[model samples]
Target: SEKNLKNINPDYRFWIKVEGTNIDFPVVQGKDNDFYLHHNFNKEKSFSGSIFVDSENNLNDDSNIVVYGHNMRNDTMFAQIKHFKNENFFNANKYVTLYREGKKSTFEIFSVYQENAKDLESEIKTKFSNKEDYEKYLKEQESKSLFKRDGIDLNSNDRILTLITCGYDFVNARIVVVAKEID
Candidate 1:
């Protein structure tokens, strides 16, 4: 199915076609990088900046990938990400495949939910002084998770992928889907 993704029109110059969806929009690169606001639907309204990357990339490295697009009224861009709210959708689309430069990686969805900005960082940041501390952090994230999973081992070399988008109401609120690298 990754072949389907490669067929997307690269000339669009805005966003890449996510597998299983026709939505295409520019993904923010980084806070200070170029094209921060260029891909947004509301270009006139200034927002934060970041780059969006396929979720299969390794997470242990300096992979601060952030996918950016407008939460359009018509449910375009990052809209499909919201479908994870339904357990049925999550069950059917449990795996996400990302292709780049002829190499493809598949990621298994492990967690999905909406949380405050503070909670998001606390769960994402790696700040453990010991294995116990790290376990505690992971446990906390799992406890707060809206959807359940067998749990992922954070100590491995594999990277954990998190897809974030705007939530329904709160401005600081966000919907995030956490996935683990899979072969």
Candidate 2:
């Protein structure tokens, strides 16, 4: 049923692209977490894997949406996001468009950081109790980050999107980009 230029692949369930950048790609979900790690959007064998969503998350209800991508060597894919550590870059290119079922939504950049991959699973989850719980989570995430950008406030009811990639200067490191749905 998938049928679009960027979504021609059946495995691709979503479209991901950064504004003003060529970091555009199709997103897909696999039977297991390791499938897309070595496969492209078409499910083809490639090192530059497709951006993906966690298997446990469903698109029907929006909450904490987490997307994953690889850091290609040419500074493409998630590698380009490495520049987001700079406040200027984060300010200029702060929105991400996500296409689902032909409907597109823009998410505003709020939090960007680097965290240990060892806590990867526990780090990215969708549902939370209230402002208190999410506030705690936000504080924890910001505290763990080497590069922190403040200003955007996350509330209990606001749906959030998290973009995660490989990080620098640590084993099992991960770079995380957190945003809130603006419109």
Candidate 3:
């Protein structure tokens, strides 16, 4: 999946496939986060830009990985991300797959919500000091979720994937999908 893209732009890190949506796209991480926000996978200018990771986050080590895409009108990029807001859709589409290098890492989606863009940093944290901190983070995330899932059984050892896109609720509103790596 990454072979062809690397030749064009080494920043094309991995492929993110959100099950039950048309969100399968090459994820990029430029030197700075702003570049990919307005550029497509080919590194060309486009409104529906590439799905990208936060420039500061290291895919191999970060506790919370933050990914971004636009909420386009034509269902491109992360436009379909709003599907998770429905409890029925959230139940059926519980997994998100990430293809990195050659291995596929599966993440179980557990939290889906909408929050103001300015407050995003408060929700998408990358590190936790200890197990208690991690637990506290998860608890807060679950509490904010639109619907609850039972027997989540997450802990400090797990990694989180936070997908973000624009929301129509208000100006600068964002839709957030929070998931934890299962394997």
**TM-score of each model, paired residue for residue:** 0.63, 0.84, 0.94
**Candidate 2 error regions (>4 Å):** 5-8, 129-132, 142-151
Q: Is candidate 2 or candidate 3 better by TM-score?
A: 3
- Per-residue CA lDDT of model 1 for 1-183, tens digit only, reads 333332432212123444344444443233332354344323333444223543332333432233444444456656777777788766666665554455556667777788776766555643346556655655555566677765555443444556666678576777877666676
lDDT of 1 at 87: 83
Model 1 regions more than 4 Å off:
1-28, 31-69, 118-123, 126-137, 150-155, 169-171
Model 2 C-alpha lDDT per residue in residues 1-183, reported as the tens digit of each score: 337644456666778887646777777877767888887766779988777887667777747778788875477778887877777787777788988787988987777777788788675776676668876776666565545446666556667778888877688788888777885
Clashing pairs in 2: none
Q: Summing lDDT over every window of 10 consecutive residues in candidate 2, give the lowest-scoring window.
A: 1-10
Better of 1 and 3 by lDDT: 3
User: What's model 3's TM-score?
Assistant: 0.94
List per-prediction Cα lDDT, in the order shown: 0.53, 0.74, 0.86
lDDT of 3 at 43: 81
Using TM-score as the measure, which candidate wins?
Answer: 3
- At residue 118, candidate 3 shows an lDDT of 79
Better of 1 and 3 by TM-score: 3
